[PDB]
Ligand binder design. Structure first.
Ligand SMILES: OC[C@H]1O[C@@H]2O[C@H]3[C@H](O)[C@@H](O)[C@@H](O[C@H]4[C@H](O)[C@@H](O)[C@@H](O[C@H]5[C@H](O)[C@@H](O)[C@@H](O[C@H]6[C@H](O)[C@@H](O)[C@@H](O[C@H]7[C@H](O)[C@@H](O)[C@@H](O[C@H]8[C@H](O)[C@@H](O)[C@@H](O[C@H]9[C@H](O)[C@@H](O)[C@@H](O[C@H]1[C@H](O)[C@H]2O)O[C@@H]9CO)O[C@@H]8CO)O[C@@H]7CO)O[C@@H]6CO)O[C@@H]5CO)O[C@@H]4CO)O[C@@H]3CO
Length: 372
């Protein structure tokens, strides 16, 4: 039998359907008392929401896979048991297991596959128009945010550099301090004068108001964008960009969204928390998430279900996940420093605060900063 009390943190607009999932959980586990709330600052900030006071934080919380190495090394999350590991590994696609594994051990329960795509108004742009960045932006406005390194760091990967080495596990393996890194910096700088590229802190609002024909966004907004665009909804994988005069696919990050168990819990509450985390990331629960938000399951069977297989967003995400089209976010503890330093590097190139004469110096300093 499973008993105990568990606090669950989810992202703000997810609460209504996690309440439905928790109702399903309580059919099987009637004696577990779950309190579902939004988190203080969302899954993109889980490591600090938990770290500021682990005993006060939720017992089960939503967290993106890049944060897991930091949280594991800090002792905020424990390895999954052998049986829990086997379930994750057997039920979900390979990259989901890679996403939650740190030094050979799993530290979270994966449930969704996240890659950004182009979302666009098909009354304004065609499927052919969105194949290239310059071609798209010559025909309509793309709204985006150059202060967000999750949006734009992958251009360095398109340029042929590595982030923490071949597989994201090599502390000294970022090699962006090179001519290839400079090519990415120059691409950011070019976009400042591209009249079809609109800098904004709220790209989705620009799509809603009609000021943008296209945005880059992820599947957490799939159902949201389908509602906004209605019969004009369309989606595509990322386009090619020109780097050093060559067309290359513009990458996104591949992220795995997860739930983790707070290591503070003990006794019955710990068992209840692990049971909840397993349940809310099971196939049925992943399909409920899909039905509400459009997020893409990592469960092998769910991905091949008719409804997911016919969804154009799922198809675009599956394309994005292929080698060359994205890179799995690394989960090194150093990712904290990476994210902090990457945003001003990219935005400085875009705004011109970093001129071309300084690209090499700034990239050298960046690599030193993130490679300790
Ligand atoms: O809008 C939808 C979301 O709304 C709600 O989110 C709001 C927050 O609740 C509210 O607090 C606020 O956030 C601001 C915050 O208050 C400020 O303090 C500041 O944040 C700084 C932060 O405090 C610092 O510690 C630091 O953060 C670093 C962080 O520690 C580190 O891990 C890393 O972050 C990177 C992630 O780890 C990485 O995974 C990736 O994040 C992706 C993510 O993977 C992907 O899923 C996607 O996230 C979606 C999410 O799935 C959706 O559910 C939806 O979330 C809503 C929230 O749940 C609500 O709480 O939308 C999300 C965004 O699309 O996209 C993420 C990328 O955007 O990359 C991360 C790096 O970008 O590095 C950071 C930076 O070093 O620095 C912070 C910045 O100063 O700023 C906050 C934002 O203004 O406002 C939120 C709404 O904007």
């Amino acid at each position: 039998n499973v008993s105990g009390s568990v606090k669950l943190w989810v992202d703000t607009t997810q609460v209504p359907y996690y309440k439905k999932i928790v109702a399903n959980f309580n059919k099987k586990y009637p004696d577990v008392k779950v309190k579902v709330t939004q988190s203080p600052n969302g899954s993109a900030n889980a490591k600090t929401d938990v770290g500021k006071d682990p005993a006060k934080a939720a017992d089960v919380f939503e967290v993106a896979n890049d944060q897991l190495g930091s949280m594991a090394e800090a002792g905020y999350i424990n390895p999954l048991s052998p049986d829990a590991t086997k379930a994750v590994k057997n039920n979900n696609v390979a990259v989901a297991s890679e996403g939650v594994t740190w030094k050979g051990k799993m530290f979270a329960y994966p449930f969704a596959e996240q890659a950004q795509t182009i979302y666009y108004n098909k009354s304004k742009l065609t499927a052919d128009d969105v194949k290239t960045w310059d071609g798209l932006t010559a025909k309509g406005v793309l709204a985006t945010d150059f202060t967000n390194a999750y949006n734009f760091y992958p251009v360095f990967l398109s340029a042929g550099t590595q982030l923490y080495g071949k597989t994201g596990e090599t502390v000294k393996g970022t090699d962006v301090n090179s001519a290839k890194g400079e090519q990415a910096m120059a691409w950011f700088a070019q976009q400042k004068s591209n009249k079809g590229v609109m800098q904004t802190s709220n790209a989705l609002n620009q799509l809603k108001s009609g000021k943008a024909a296209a945005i880059l966004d992820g599947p957490w907004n799939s159902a949201n964008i389908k509602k906004i665009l209605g019969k004009n909804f369309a989606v595509a994988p990322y386009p090619t960009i020109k780097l050093d005069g060559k067309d290359v696919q513009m990458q996104a990050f591949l992220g795995i969204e997860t739930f983790a168990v707070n290591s503070h819990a003990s006794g019955s509450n710990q068992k209840a928390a692990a049971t909840l985390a397993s349940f809310i990331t099971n196939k049925e629960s992943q399909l409920i998430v899909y039905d509400h938000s459009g997020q893409i399951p990592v469960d092998k069977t769910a991905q091949k279900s008719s409804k997911v297989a016919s969804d154009p967003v799922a198809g675009a995400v599956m394309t994005m996940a292929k080698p060359g089209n994205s890179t799995l976010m690394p989960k090194m503890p150093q990712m904290a420093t990476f994210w902090n330093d990457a945003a001003p590097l990219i935005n400085g190139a875009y705004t011109g605060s970093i001129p071309a004469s300084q690209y090499s110096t700034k990239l050298d300093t960046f690599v030193k900063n993130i490679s300790k």
